[model samples]
Target: SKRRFSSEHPDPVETSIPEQAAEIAEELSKQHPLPSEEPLVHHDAGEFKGLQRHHTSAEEAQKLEDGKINPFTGREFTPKYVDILKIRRELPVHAQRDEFLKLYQNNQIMVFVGETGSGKTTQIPQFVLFDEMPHLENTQVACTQPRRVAAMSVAQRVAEEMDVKLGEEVGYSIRFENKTSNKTILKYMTDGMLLREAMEDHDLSRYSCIILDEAHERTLATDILMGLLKQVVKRRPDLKIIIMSATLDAEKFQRYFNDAPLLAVPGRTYPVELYYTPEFQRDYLDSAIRTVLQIHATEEAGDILLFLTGEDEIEDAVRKISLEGDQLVREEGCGPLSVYPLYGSLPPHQQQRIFEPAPESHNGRPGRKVVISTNIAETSLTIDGIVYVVDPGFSKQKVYNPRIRVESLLVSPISKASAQQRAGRAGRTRPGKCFRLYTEEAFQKELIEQSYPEILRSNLSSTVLELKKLGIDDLVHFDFMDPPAPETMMRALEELNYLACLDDEGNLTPLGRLASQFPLDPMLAVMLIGSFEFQCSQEILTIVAMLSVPNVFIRPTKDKKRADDAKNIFAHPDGDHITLLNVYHAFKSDEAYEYGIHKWCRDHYLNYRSLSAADNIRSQLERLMNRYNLELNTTDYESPKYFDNIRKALASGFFMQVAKKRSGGYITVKDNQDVLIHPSTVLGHDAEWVIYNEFVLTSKNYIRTVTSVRPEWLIEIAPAYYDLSNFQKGDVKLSLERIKEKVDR
Candidate 1:
C-alpha cells in the first residue's frame, strides 16, 4: 500500500487556470494587459510535508495515567471520580464491563456493536482516553461521526459525565466551526471534515488515535477515509485506529484488517420485549400509525419513540396520532400526550419541544412523551425515557440519477441493523416493549443484511474531486474497498469531461486541474470556471455556495402561508430558478452585515443555519478559485456582454435536465422518464415560457425551469441531443381546445 513517487516534479512552473476562462478574457478584454510571467519553482517531490505519524508500538506508547488527560473536559483527566463512578457503574452487564476494559487495554482497533440503549458512543472514548492502561500520548482521543448534530451532542454528554464545562475540556469540529484547542482531547468531528483532513495529510498525523464511530452506516466519505487509513497503516505503524458500530458485520472488518486486534463490547441495557402488529404485513404510510395505535390500545404507561422517513410522513403521523389521542381524551379522561416531530427542516423551537417534559393532562395527569422523528435520532441525538418503540421501517434517501443528472428522494426499507438500533431505543430507561411494524419473517427476508453504502446510491461529484486533489489520476483504479458502480464513475467523468476538466483521452486538462482546488461538485466548478470569463465571479460564487448545503425553505406547518410567503419574497417571475437563487444570495449577502441572520430568517420564514452554511461554502469557493490563478475584477472584462457566456456555461451544466413542450402542456423528460413539476416550485405552474428544465429534488420531483435564455449558450453548451422540434415539453398538456398554432393565434 505504501509507495514512493519520483523526486522530480513535472511542469512545476505551469499555471492551473482554466483555458475557457482565458479565451473569454481575450474576447471580453479588448485592451489585453501584458501577459504576466508564470511563477517558476524547482522540481522536488521530497519538499512536500507528508503524514507525520503512520504507526506506533506498545513499547513506544508506554501507558500514561488514566486521569492524566480528561478527553471529555480536555483538562487533566482523572479516572472516574466519586460522582463519575456512579454513572459508569450504571453501565450494566459484567461482559460489557470486561469488553470496555479490554478495548482500552488490549486492542488498538475495536468495533462495539451495541443497541441504542448502550452508552457506548457517549462513554467509550472517555474510558479509553482516561483509563490507566491505554494512556494515550495526546490528551485528545478523536471521535468521528457522520453528522454535525451527533458530533456536538456526544461531546456534550462526555462533558456532563466529567462534570466540567463544555468548550473548556471538550469541543466539536464541524463545517465552519471547531472548538478544539492545544489542551483539548477527545474531540468530536464529522466524517466529511475528517476525510478532508486525510486528503491534506493522508495518515491523519494530528491525533494519536482516530475512532471512526458508526462505521456501519457506510457513507462514501467514511469508506474513502477507510481506504486512506488502510494505506496510512503502512506509512505509520504505531498509530491506533478504532472502528465503532452499533450494528454491523464486525468480522468482515476484522478480516479486512487482517484480523487486526478485534474487541467486541457488549451494550448496557435491560432486556427489551418486541411485539408485531397487523400493519407489519405491508409497507405503507399508515402501517407505522396502525402499529403505534395497536400498541397504545393496551394503555401502555411509557414514552413512545416513532421513527418515520421524512417531514411529510412525520407531520401526517403526528396529525393522525394527535387526532386519535384527542378523541380518546374527549371521550374519556385520557391524558394529553405531547407529540413532538423532529427533522432537519423543522424550526429549532419545534424540534426542541421533544426535549421538554410532556404537558400536564387537562385532568391533572402526566402526559406521555410521543416523539415522531426522521433518522436524525438514529445515531447522533439520543432522547431519554423512550420506553415504547414503533418503527416505520423506512427512511428517505436522495437517490441521484447520473444519466439524467438529477436527484430524487425515494422512501426505502431500513436495514436489519437499523431495525435493531431503533428497537434498542425502548430499553434505554427501563425494561420496555417495542412494537415492530414488520414481522420477524419480513425483518429477516425483506430487510437487507446491511444498509446501502452511500457511494453506491449518491452522485459521485465530490468523491472524484477529492481523488483528483490527492494526485490520483486513475481514480477508477484507486484502492476503494467497495468502489462505486462503473456507471457512477462514468457519470462523474462525463460531467468533468463536459466541463473541459478532462480531454476526450481522460487526462486532466488545465481547467480540470484548476477545478480540483475547489471543494465543490463538478457542475459548480464549471460555473466558477465560466465566471472568470464573464467577469461575474462574485455572483457565481454565491450560486456555488448555495448548491452545497441544505435549502432555506422551512417545513410547511399549519399556516402554509409561512412557506408561501418565503418564496414570494425571493420570487422573480420573469427570471428562472437560477435568478431566484441569485436574488436570495444577493439579498442575504447585503443583510448579513446589518442584521442577525437568525432574526432575518424568522421574518422571512427561512432557515438561518442553511443560509449561513451557503455563505460559508461561497466564501470557500472564492478562495479556491483564487488558488487556480483566476482573479475576480469587475473591470477585467472589456464589456458586460461576457455575462451571456457565463449563463450558457451554467446551462451546459444542467442541460441533461432540460424539459420540452407537449401538444397541450409542458413535460420534462428526466432519466428517460417523464415527470411533472411541483406546484410550489417557482415556474411549476407556468411551463409555457420556460426554455429548459433546470434541476429537481424530493418526492414530488419538483421540476424547475430556467428562463431568460441566451440562445447562443444553449447551442454552444447542449446543442441538439435529440431533434424533437415538434415535441411539446413541460407539465401543461394541451387539449384540442387549448392547442392553437402560432398562425391561428
Candidate 2:
C-alpha cells in the first residue's frame, strides 16, 4: 500500500529550532533517511523490536512546551500529567538537563553522580531523548538498572511523565516480564538483560544512548557492561554513554572511562541524625531487638525500620520485638506496635505490608509499625514512611574461595557505604534518626570504605563464559574498574577448559557458545547439553532446574524428624540428584495436584515457592532447548538403565566435583580437602565415590547435595580430568589408577 505526506503532517517550523539542534536533526536524518509514510519495523540484537517513525521536528518539541495535544497519542495532556511535569521540574537533575545536553553533545562518554532522590534515574534519559531525537534514527535510548523493581517502577513513572501510554513511549525489560512494544523509543531494563542482549549482538547497536544507572553498586552485570561499553565507544563513536552512580566513586569512574566529564547533583532528603552505641556489641541480633524495644519505649512516634541478616534472624527478631513491645505497652504505657518481617523469600503480597501505614492509635497510646528486614530492603526496595532506622551493620554476603572451589554465604559486617545507605533509608520521608548498634569507633574505623564489588567477590566461571561468548579476545587486559583476583581468573579458565567450553588456548569452543545461551551456570549448561548424549535430557533438565533454585526440602526446627521421614520416601538409593527427580515427579503427579499441591507441600515439609520456581525455570530451559535445537530425550522410566543414565549425565558436568571416600569422610578429587558429607544428603556412607553439587562451609567443611557415581564413569565422562599421569601420587589417584586397570581387564 502507498501512503502520502501532506501539508497537515507535523513538520518543523524553520525558525523555532536553534542552529545546534537543527544540525543534530539534519545529521540524524542524513545518517538514517526517512522511509515512506508506511510504518517501518526494525529489530536489533534479535531481542529489541521497535518501529521507526519520521523525526520529531523543532515544532513538535515546541508543541510539547506549548501545551498542545500530543499528535502521536491524539489526546490532550491530562491535568495529572501537567502536575507531574511541575514536580519533575523541581528535582535536582531537572535543573541540569540543558547543561547535561551540552556536555552530552560534545563528549562520547560522561559520568553522572546523583545522590539519593536526585531523580537522575528518571529524568536524565528523557533529557537525552529530547536532544538525540532517536525516533529519527529508528534507535531507542536504553537505561539499565541493577534490579528489576527499579527498572519497572522507574519506567512506569517516566511513561506517565512523558504523557505516553506505558509500553508505547517507555517500557521496561526484565528477566521474566517484558512490558515493551514496537512504539517504545525509551526502554528501561535490568543490566543483566542488556548483557544478555549483548551476547547475541556484540555491538549493542539497538541503542543510541546507553545509560547505566546505579553503577556504584558495581553489580556483576553493571561492571561487565562498563568494560564492554568502554570498548564499544571506540567502535561506535556515534553512540553516547552515561555512567550514573550515587557513591563518591566518580573519580574512579572518570579515570576508568578515559577521564570522562562528570556532573554531580545533590539529593533531596531531610537531615538524619546518627546515633551509635558506646560499646561494641557481641550479639547483633540481641542488640537489634533491644534497640527496637528501647525506641518503642522512649522515642517519639514513627515507623521504625530494622536491618537484620537473613530470613531466620529477621523472623526471630520480629518475634522477640513483638513480645517485648507488647510488654512495654501493657506495663510501661508504650505505644501500640505492629511488627513485620521483610526479606526476598517472603511472598510479594506479604512484602507489600511494609508500605502499609502504622496501626491506628489504641486507647491513649500512639500507634507504631516496626519492619525487620534483610538486605533486600537496603537497595532492592524502599519504604517511604520510615522515620527511624536501626542498623546492626551486618548482612549475609556471598564469598567464593578459588582455592577450595567453593562459594558460601556468611553473616558478615557491612561496610561504611552500607551503613550510610541504611541511615539514608530513615531520611527518605522526613527528618529522621538512625540508631547504630555498633560503637562510634567501629563506624569510623572498623568498617571498610565500601563493600567489595560483587565481581571481585564472586566465582568468575560463569562470568568468564559470558565474556568468552561476548567475543572478549583478551580477558586479562579487559578494562575492569576493579579486576578480580588473578587466582580466581585462573580457576575459572581451568574449570572451563576441563568442561571443554574453552580450548587450551583459552578460546571459546562451540560447546562454550551453546553453554552461554542458557541462563544457568556454565557447569549446569554443560550438564544439560551432555544429557542429550546420555539420552536423559528431560531428567537432567528437571535436576538442573531444582539445583538452580533454593533448597526444596523444608526442614523446620521443630519438625526436622518428620521432614527427614518424608524426604526418605523419595530418596533414590543412588543419590540426591535422582531423589530430587523423584520429588519433582511426585509433585507433578495427578494425586498430588488433586489433593492440592500447596497442601501436599505443607504436609510433606517442602517449599512450594522454590518448587514452583523450579517448574518455571524448567519451562524456560525447555524453551531454550527447543530454540537451540538441543534434543529433549528421555530414557524409559521403568528401564534399569534409566537411573544409571541419569547418574552418568550428572558426572558429565561435575567431573571435577567428584570426591573419594576416606576413613574419616571424603577427600575431594581436585583439591584434596577433607570434608564430611552434609547430613542433608540421602546417599548412605557405603558409596565409595561421589560427585557433589556444592561445597558448603558452615560449622565445618561439608559436601552437600551429592550423588553416587561409578569410578569407571569418571574416566569415561572426563578422561582428561581423571588422567592418573597428571595427578599427584595420592590415595585418590592410586584408587583411580587401580579402577582404570580393572576396566582394562
Candidate 3:
C-alpha cells in the first residue's frame, strides 16, 4: 500500500515485467557494486510481468542488534526467531536449504519439478509452513492434487508428521467428506474441485499462497486451471503461485508463468535396478502375475507390489494366487501366504489394509504378501513394508479414436517416469529391488519420459463442456500449456452437437452446460437428461446410481451356478438392458447389503469399480436435478411410468449399441466383427434375446443396444431385406403362416 504512486511517476501496467525487473536490478547493481567474476542468476525460461525484483543499495546495508541499529553496513534489520531446527527436521531431503530460504526470504514464486520419490508432494508444504521466514508476511498455505484419495491420504500423512489430529492443522475436502476446519493451516483438494472453489472466489483471497501439486499429470482440469491461474497471478501480484510437477517439462510451466523461479529437489532413495519385459512376455495380465509369483520366490523383506492393467488381471491373479496359496499350505505344508488386491474399486477401508503391517511379523516369521493393483496404486498410496516391486510395465490407457469417435483400452508400456515411480515402491522403508517384466533393452527403446497428458488421450467432450461452463469461449487463445489436438476437440464438438448438448457452431447448449456440471460420462449425462424429458426423472436416478459405479455382484465368492440363478430372476425373454437396471435397484434395496457388495459383485462377474462409479454418478445427477428444480421421487409404486421412461431414455443413448438376433438364434452387433457382449452385462450369456442391434464403438469402449425398445421390440442388426427383393423371403414366411390359419380379415 505504501508503494502506490501518481500516474506521473509511471504507469505500472504499461511496462512489461521483465523490463521492469531488469531496470530495477540494474539500478540496484549500480548502487551496490558486485564482484565482476560472480556468476549471475538471471531469468530462466519465460517472460515476466508487472512486478520486478529490486536489489537494495549498499548504502542501506547494515546489521541490527536487538532492534538497535548498528553503525555497520546500512541495511540494518531485526531478525526474528529463525526456525532452522524445524525446517531441518521436517525437510532433510531438500538439499538446497539456502535456495529454499531465498524464495521464502524474498517472497519469490518458485516452481519445483521433482520426480515421484522426491518427497515434494508430502514434504514441500512443511518446508513452507514451518520455514524460518515466510515471504508472504504471515499467511496460510494450501495445495491441491488431482484425486480425492490422494488428497485424504496425503493430508493424513502430513498431519501425522506434525503430530496433530487430521483436521487440527492439515485436512482434506472431497465430495462427501471435509475434515477441514478454520484452524486448518494446509489443505488438499482435487484439482477439479479446486477449480470449482476458484469459480466461487476467483481471487482466492482466503489463502496467501496456492500450490498446484502434480502439475505434470496434465489432466484436462489441470491444463484449463493453469490457464485460469495465469490471469489470477497477474491480478494479485502478492499472491504467490507455486507449481510442483513430477515430469521433466519445467519449460512449459516456466513459459506459462513468465519464467517463474524454478527449484529442483532430488529424490532420496536407494538404487533400484530396472527390468523390461521381453516381447514374448509383454502380454499384460497373465505375464504380470506369473512374474510376481516368480519374483516373490527370490525377493526379500519387501511386500510384493504387482501392477496389473485392469480388473480382469487383478481378479485372475487373485484367484490363481489364492488357490495356489491354499493348496501349498495344505499339501506342501508351506507357511501361510497372504494375497491383498488393491484397486480403485476396493472400498476405502480395504485399501487402507494393504499398508497395515503383516501379522506374521509379530511371530518373527513374515510370510510372503502379494499385492495386485492398478495404476491408481502406482503413485497415490504409499504401501509401507513393500520391498519387491513387480511392474507389468504396462497400463490400460483409454485412447480415443476421433475418426470413429470410439474409445478402447490399449495395454501399453508405462512411461519411463511411471517406471521410475513404480520402482520407488521397492525402496520404501528400506532398500528394495524392482523386477520389470519387460527386458532392459525394450525399456530403453520404448519408454517415454512421461505418460501422454490425460487430456490429449481422453474424450474431450467433458473438457470442452467444462470450459464452456467456466465461461471460456476462445480455447485457442487460452493459456493452455499443451492444448489438445484440434481434431479431437472438433470431434467432441460434433458428438456434443449430435446429443443436443452443443449448437451447430460448438457453443454449449443448455443440456450440455448442465452436463458439464455433472461428473459423468457424456452419454451417461445425456441419458439422465433425456429421462427428464420422458418424465422418468426419479427412476432414472436409480438407474443412474446403479450404472454409474461398480456393480455389487460377487460371482467369485458364491457358487457360479447359484449366482447365475440369482441373476436370471432379472432377465427378460428378450435381452433388454432394462432387466439389468431392475436387478441393480433390487439389490440396492435388498437387506443383503450385509452380504458385502464385493462378494456380490464377484459372484455375478461384475465390475465393482464401475458399480461404485455409478453410485457416485447417481448422487451427482441427483444434485444436478435438484439445481434445475427437478425432484426425483424414488417410490416405485408412485412412479411405475418413471421406470419405463428411464428405460426409453437409456435406450436413446445406448441405441447404437444394441444386439440383434438372426434366424440361426445367434445375436450379432451392427458394426462389430465379433459378437462380444460386455461380460458385466446380464445379456452377455444370453445374447440370443437382444434384437434390433444399433452399435457404436467410441474410443474403444464398446456399447451397443436397440434404440426406442419396447416389449415387443422388433430388433435386428441388419435385416436380410431392405428393398422389395429381400422382402420376398419375409413374405414367404408370412404366406406360410397365413396359409396355416383360417381366413380372418
Candidate 4:
C-alpha cells in the first residue's frame, strides 16, 4: 500500500487556543492521556488516587480470561466475546502468559522474540494490560507498529477481542487521526506518532508500559524510539518496556539493552520446504515466469505467491501468465488459472482482489490463483491459502548517497531476514514449499543477515531536530544501535544550522523548537514559521498542506487529454505551488458545491481522497499555529507582488533546495548536480530560479514538485545559506554573484 495519512471530521469548535491546550493538560491528568493538538475528555476515577498500580490477582484474571464476567466495567459478558475468547486461548502466546509476566514484572526492560503467526502483535499487549491494570491509575499501555495500517487494523481487531467500543477503552492515534477518548487504557499507534508525543512530553509519562512491535523492521522512527526509551527507563523506574520482534535477532537487541533477558514464543507455523536453483540465473523476470507455469503443471493444488521487484514488472508478469495459462488449458487440458498484480501504487479496490477466492477445481484437475507482488506482501497481509512462494532473491530498496546527498531506489539482493519472512508466509496454513531462484551457496554468502536500518539510509535533517528537541545535547553520545556514518550526520547538522534550527554552540534555537512541534520535515516547518514574517501565513499554510499529501491531479491512462485540460482550468503561469493553491480555492467555492464535492472532483479529474485529507491537515496545522501565537495573514490578492511574496516565503525554507537555470537544463545550487525539471511542470515559461520539494529516482537527476522563485528572495531570506563565500567557482557562483550585488545596491 502507498504510505499516506487520513483525516477525520473537525471536533466541535472551541474557544481560545489557551484553554484548549489547557484542556489537554486538565483532561490528560484525568484519563492519564497524551497531549497533542487535540484535547481528551475528563474522567473521574478515584481508583487512580487510591492505588497507582493495580495488579489483578490470579482468581480475578481467571474469571476474565474465561469470559465469565467483564472485569473492567463489572458488566455482563457478551456471548460473542466468550466465543472469541475460546479461540484466543488456542493462540501460541496464550500458553506462555505465565512466563511472559514473570519476565515482564521482574525486569523493567525485556526482549521478546515471537515468530510470525504467533499472534504477539495483538495478544502480547493485551497480556500486559491484565498485569499492569493501567486504567486504575489513569494510565495507558501503548503499543507501537511499524506501519499505520497495521496500527489501525490491529487496534480495531483487538477492540473486538476485548468486547469494548472502539475509541472508548481501546483506540488508535496516527498523524491527523486521534481516536482515543478518556477511558482509553490500551492505545495502538504508529512508532512515528509516539515519537511526536515524546517531543511534547520528554518522559512520555502517561504510558505505564510501552510495547514496541516489529522492532526487526528497523524503521527510521522505531530506531530513534529505541534509543530514546533507553534513556527514558533510567528516569522513570515504574515505567516498563518490551522490545518485540519477529526475527531471531534477539542477541543483538538483547545486547543493545544491557543484555536484557530474552523470551521466545514458538510460532504456530508449520514446517516449510525450500528449493534452490542449481546455478545462477541471469534473467529473474523470465525465469520467475517459467517457475509459475512449471508449478501449475507439476505441483499439487496450492495458491502461488511470486515476489517481484516493482509494479510494472508484476503487471507484465500477470499479462504473460494469464495468456500462457489460457493456452495451456486449450492445448494440454490444464486447470483454469487466475493472476493478480499487487504493489503500492495500484488502486485500492484493485489491490483487494488478491484476497478474493482462487479458482475452483476444473473436472479432475486443480485450479489455482497466483499473486505476483512487491515486498509489501512480505510482512503486513497474510494469505492463509498461500502454499507456494517464488522468490527471485531481489527487491527494490532505498539507499542513500552521502556524496551527492540523494536517496535512490536500487534493485538489491533481499536480506536473509526478508527471505525468512517470505518463506514463513506460506507455512501459516499448512506445510508449504518455497523456491529460491538462486543457488543455495549464493544465498548464504551474498545476502546480509538483516536489512540496513533506515537511519543509515536516510537524510537526517528532521532527525537532528528531533534529537535536539528531546534535550539531547551531544549528538556524538546519543545511543544508536548502529550509529550512522559521520558524513551523514555532518550533512544533517550543517543543514539544520544553516536553516537557523540549531545555534552556533549546537543548541536548539527558538525557531528550531517551534519547527520541531509540527509533524513535518524541517523544510516545510521553517517555511511555515517564516510565513507570518512575509505576511503570507494563510497562503503558506495551504501550500504546505497540499504538498504534504499525495498528488491531487488525476491523469488517467485512458483520458490524459481531458485530465490535463480540466487541471489547466486552475493552472497558474507561476508554478505548481500557485496552481495547487488555485485549485484548492476553487474546491472551497460555492461553484464546486453546485455539483456536489465528490462529483465536482470526479468531473475535474481530481482525487477526492487526497483533497479532503489535505483539508483536514490544514485545520490541524492551523491549530498549532494558533497555539504558538503565529498570526495568519495574506498579501492583497490583486497586488502585483502577491505570488512573489508567497514564493519568497517558500524560499525561506527551501533555500537549500534552489536550482539555477543552465543552457543544458538546470543545476542544483548546493550539490551542483545537473538535473532536469519533471515533465509535470505547469509553468508556461522558463524560470531562472526554482525551489523544489524533493528529488526522486526514475534513473535520472529529476527534481519534483517544483515552484519557481526569484534570486533576490534567496539572498534576502536565507542569507547565511545562500551566501556565496563558500561557493565553488562555477556557473551557479557567477550567476548568483551578479544577483547578490544587485540586491546589495
Candidate 5:
C-alpha cells in the first residue's frame, strides 16, 4: 500500500492485466538502483502517460488481489485460490508485485534472477498474468523450461494454485503428450517445444508473453531460443519476453537481450547445515550408497534425499541401496524405510510415491523416505519435507565431440549452482542438513559457478537445421547468447548438405523440410526419409521408435545366463539394431497378443513398459508419416536380401557413424576414435564395417545398437563423406581410400 502509487507509472496501451497494479514495489528503491537517464519514478503522470493500457491494467491487479471475486472468470473466488494467494503473497516475489508490474509494464523484455526458492517459476508468471491480462487479448502466457518434466510437473502446481481446472485454464505441452486444451490461457511448455512452434510461426503469434525459465541451465534449446526470441521481438512488439534464470547466469541474459533491465528478488529460506567429506571418494556410487547408510546408522529420522545421476546409474544405486538397506536395518536398528527412484522412465504411479508416507510407521519409530533422483530434483521437481540431502555432485551431462559428431552422455561434475540447488531442497520443509560427498576445498575452488552452457559442449548438428528453419539464415554471423565453436557449426552444415537436408546454398531441401516435421533427431529423421527409397519405412519406424524408448531387455545383476538366453531368442543375426526390430515385431505378433502383451513380455524377460511406450511413439510417428503421405512399403520377407535392405536403410542416416575393424578392436572411421562394439551386440564378424545408432562413454569407448553394413554400401550411401580428398592421411583415410578404390574397380 505504501509503494503502489499506480498512476505514478507510464501507460503501455491495449493489453489488459486484469488486476490492478502488480505488487513488486516491495524492493523498488532499495533493491534496484535506478539509472539517472530513464528515471521512471521521477517523471510525473501526465508526461509518464507512456500508455493508457499500463495505467488501467496495473490498477486491475490491485482490485483482483483486494477482492474475494475471481478476477479471471468473473465468479466468486474459490477457497482454494484465496488460500494459495495468501501462500503466494509471502514469496519475496509477491512482495514486489508493484515493482515487477511497473518494470514489466514498461519493457518488452525483462531479466528475472532469483534463486529457485523465491518461487520464480510458479509465482512470477502469475504476476504477469494478472498484469498483462493476456486472456483479455485472446492470447496466452507461456513459461518454457529446458526439460519437459519441469514444465509438466510445475503446471499442475500452478493450476491448483491458480484455482483453475487442469488442462482448462492452466496446462502443459511437451513432446508426445500435450496436456492442454484450446481454453488454456497459461501454458507450461518445454523450450524445445516452443522452438518447434517457431518452425511453423516465426512471429510466435500464439503467445502474448514468453517466459524462458531456467535460462541458467543454458540448455541447448534455451540458448538457441534466446536468439530466436531476440530476432522475434524485432518483428513482434506485442510480445513480452522474460528470461528467468539463476543469479549466476543473468548478466549474460541482460546483456544479450540488449541490456534489458533486471528485477531481482532475494530468495527467502531458513539456514541449512553443510557437511563435507574429508577426501573425495574413489567411486561415487560406493560413496552415495554408503552415505545413505551413514544417515541410517547415525542421523535422527527425517525425509532424506540423494541427488544421483541418470536412469541406469539410479537403478543400480537403488538396487545396491535396497540390498545394503537390509543389512543397515538388521544391524543398527534403523527404522523401517521406503525408497523411490525419481527417474522419468518410471511409471507415474511409482514416481508420485515419493510423496507417500513411509510404511505406516509407529510413532517415533524413525521411518523416512529417500528419493534417489537425477537433476530433476535439483531445480525442477522439489520434494519438500526433506531434512537430509546427500550430494555426490554428478549428473549425466550431454557433450558432443565435433570430430566424432556424436552427442554422448558422460558422468560429469555438476556446477556450483546445481550444488546450491541440491542443497536448497533440504531447506524446503525445515532448516535442514546437506552433506557434500567432496571436501569444501573442491566445492570452493574447482567447481564452476555454473554449468558449461550446452552450446559450448553440444553437437550443433541438429541446431543448425533448427536455426535455419527458425529464420536464422546468416550461419556465419548469427548472434548466439554464447557463440558455439565455428567448427561445430561447420560440421553441422556440412553434414546437412551431405544428407541433402540442405542445398549448396544452405536452403532447406524437400527432404530436409519433410525431415523437420518429425520430432526425432534430424539424423534419425534423415534415415527415416531415406527409408522411403529403400522401401523400408515399416522396419525403420519400429527401430526409430524403439530407440526413442529405453532398452527393452531386462538384464539382471544376478542370473545373467538365463536373461542373456531370453534376449538371444530375438537377437537378429546382423546386429543389435535388427535384433531390436525383431523383438518389437515379436511383441506385436498375435500369439504374444493372445497371451497378453504384458505377460508375454515378462515371460521373455523384456521391459513391457518400454516396448508399450515405443508402441505409443510408433503410432504417433506413423500418423506423421501418414500426414506426409509417406508409404509404409517393406521389402519381401522371403528375400535373402531383406535384412540387407534394413541394414542399408540404417546406413542412410548413420553413414558417417561407421567403424572399421582394426586389430586393436575397432576404429570409428569418421573421428578415428578407438571403439569396441558393445558387449551386448549379437552381431559378430559377419562384416568388417558397422554403423551404430548410439555412442556412450565408459571406462573404454563403446558403440551401441550397432548393425553390420558392407563397405560398398557405406561408400554408396554418402559418397561425399566417404570421399578421400576431404580427409587427412591416417589409418582412417588409408583404409577408406582402399574401399573407394575397391568400389571403383
Candidate 6:
C-alpha cells in the first residue's frame, strides 16, 4: 500500500523523468516515480543509513557559495568556515585528497608519507571521515601524535575547519585531561593515550580508522601500536589504518605491513642551503657558540637557532652568546640581539618568550634574535620564523647495558637522519641556511643513518608489565619491529617475579593485576600496596608521590650554604626518606599554611612547582586506592613506630636495591657494585645498611635518595629476595648469613 497527500497542500517528493521530454510532460500524471530516502538528522542515536547512500553518489560536495550544507553534521556552513575552507584547499595535502581516498578505499592498511608543511596531520583524518562515513556506524576516526602539544594544537585547528564546537566534533586526549564527549567523531590523542585505551579494549572497536602521525620519531608507544595493529587488522577486516611519517623510508613501512599501498605528498617549504666545516672541531660547544656570533654579526636579519646537548650546556652557551653579542654591538656596530633559551623543563610562560618578535633594529643596524635550545626543538617542538640553524651534531642519548641492567644518559653524536631533520627546521617559513660544525668528510663517513630506537636502549620492566596487561601471552614470541635483547626480556621477568607481580610460571598474580592499574613503576606500586599491611598507607602515599616527580629541594649556586641550612631543618637523623617526609609534613603544617606555601617555599629554597605536582599525584593515587578498596590507614606522627613502619613499607619493594656499608662507603648486595652516598644525602656515609632509590653514574658511581634499614627487617619482609643460596661468597653474604641465624634464633 502507498500513502498519498491531499492536492490542496501536498509535500514535495523526488521523481524521475524519461528521455522523451515532450511525451513525459504530456503524460506526467500517468507516470510513476520512486520516493527519495529521508535526510539524516543530528540527534539520531544509531547508524544513519542516509549517509551510506550519500557517500556513494560521487557527487561534488556543496561549495560555500552555493549555500553549502555539511553532509556529516547536517548544519549550514558559515562565511568564516568558507574562508577557512579556501585556506585549507591551498595546502599540499588538499590537492591530493582524491589520490588519498582512492588508495585508502582499496587498502585495509596504508602508509602516508608527508613532510612538515604538508598538513597531513590535520587533513588526513577529515578525508577519512568523508569516505569511511564513521557517523553512520557510530564510530570515530582517530589520529595519534607523538606529543601532547601537537595533539591539542592540531585538534583545535581541525575543529575550526569543520565549523563545529571544539569538543563536540573534534577533541584531543592527553595525560590528566580528555577534552572529548559522546559527540566527538574525530579525535586526536597522544600515542601513549591510545596505548592506554588499547589496554582496556583490545580490538579498539570504537574507531573506524586510526591514523598514526609522526611515525618517523619511533616513540615507544608508536612502535608498539604498529606491531599491535599488524595483528589487529587480521581480526578487524572492516577497520582502516593509516601510518603517516615524514621520513624517506616509506618502503620499510610498506614492507612491514605486507606491501601496503603508499601515498607520498610533497611538502610546501622554502629552500635551505647546507654548509659544513672545512676541518673537524674537537670542542663542538665552542664551535657552536662561535658560529652563532658569526651569524649575528655578518648574516642577515633572520633569527638564529643553536642546538646544544642539555640544560647545563644550553645555559652556558646562552651566557657566552649574550656577552659576545654585546661586544659585536660595541666594536663592529652590530645591532642589538634578543636571546632566549628553550627546553622541556622550562616553565610554559618562560618558553613563550621565544615567540615575541625580534628586537627592533638599533641605530640603523639590523636587529636579530638567537635561540639556544636542546634537541627538544628538533622534534617534539617547533618555533616559526627560524631562518638560520647552527648544529653541533650532538645530543644527550640514553644507553642501556643488559649485563648490569642499568640505563645511563650520555652526550653522543647525532645520526645522519637527525642531521637532516635539524637542517630541515631552518626552511619551514622561508629560504634559509644551516651551518654544520662538522666537516663534510665526517658527515659522509662517520654518522649512522638513524639513531637506535628507544626500545633497544631502555629498561624493559615497565614495557613488559604493560604487555602482560594487554592480554599478551608468550612475550618471547610476540613480534616487535625491532626485538630487544633476550637478556633484557629475561631480566624484566625476573624483576617482576621477585616483586611477586609474576609467579615462577610467569603469570600475572592478583598483586600484579592491581599494580598494573596504576601509572607508577612496578616497585612504587608494590610499596604502595604493602603500606596497607604496615598501617601507614597515608604517609606512604605522600612518599611515593614525592619520589615519582623531580627533586623538590633546590640547591642554588649563589646561596648553597643558605639552602643547605634550610634543608637541614627538615633533615632526619635516620636517612633521606624520613627527611623527605618531614619536609612534606612541615609544608602542610598550620604555621606553614598561615605563612603561605609559595613564600615559604621561596624562603626555604624549595621548588613550588614540583611540590604542587606531587600534591596532585598524591590525590590521584588516593583515588586509585579508594577504587581498589585499598585501606588508607595512618600512624601517629609523634609515635616512635611511625617512621619505623614507613621504612619497612619501603623495604618491601626495595629489598633488591639494598646495599651494605663497607670500610669505605657501601656496596650493593646483589652485584657488589661499589658506590658512595651522594653528597645530597643526609646520612653522610654513616648508615651500616641502606636501600637507595636510584644508582647514578656521573663523575663517580653514586647511590642517591637513600634510607637506613636493619638487616633483620630485609629477611622478614622479603625472605625470597634474601635467600642465602642465591648469594656469592663475599662480606655481604657472610653478614646476611649472620642476620639469618640471629632471626631464626
Q: For this target, which candidate reaches the highest lDDT against the unseen true structure?
A: 4
Provide TM-scores for the models.
0.73, 0.85, 0.71, 0.83, 0.86, 0.84
C-alpha lDDT values of all predictions: 0.61, 0.78, 0.58, 0.80, 0.76, 0.78
Indicate the TM-score of model 1. Answer: 0.73
For model 6, what is the alpha-carbon lDDT of residue 719? 63
| Candidate of highest TM-score | 5
TM-score of the candidate numbered 5?
0.86
Q: Give the range of the ten consecutive residues with the poorest summed lDDT in model 3.
A: 715-724
Instruction: Assess the local accuracy of residue 677 in candidate 5 as a C-alpha lDDT between 0 and 100.
Output: 75
Better of 4 and 5 by TM-score: 5
Q: Tens-digit lDDT track for model 6 on 704-729?
A: 89999988888767666676766898
TM-score comparison, 1 vs 2, better candidate:
2
Better of 1 and 2 by lDDT: 2
Write the candidate numbers in order of decreasing TM-score. 5, 2, 6, 4, 1, 3
* Candidate 5 Cα outliers beyond 4 Å, as residue runs: 1-53, 56-82, 319-336, 346-350, 356-360, 402-405, 445-449, 593-599, 672-674, 697-700, 724-745
Give me the displacement of residue 692 in model 2, in angstroms. Answer: 0.8
Candidate 1, residues 312-390, lDDT tens digits: the string is: 5687789999888777677755777678888765543455578787666666544677889888787656687777888
Clash pairs for candidate 4: none
1-745 in candidate 5: lDDT tens per residue? 2212123221111011100111111123235544432111111223212224444343456565657655555445677777777776777776777788787878999998876667888988887876666766677888998876677777878887877778878888887767877667888999988889889778888789999998877788888888888888998999999988766456767888999999888766668899999997888888888888778667776788988877778878778888777666677666777778877666545666786776555535577678898888887767657889999988878776666666777788988878888888888667889989988999999988876788888887778888888767787688877888888888788777767677666787656666777787777887776675676889988999998998999888787899989998998765688888899999999999899888899889998878988888889898876655566788889988788888877887778788878853788877678887788774556668888877876778898888888888766666656656567877777877787667442
In candidate 2, what residue range of length 10 has the lowest lDDT sum? 10-19
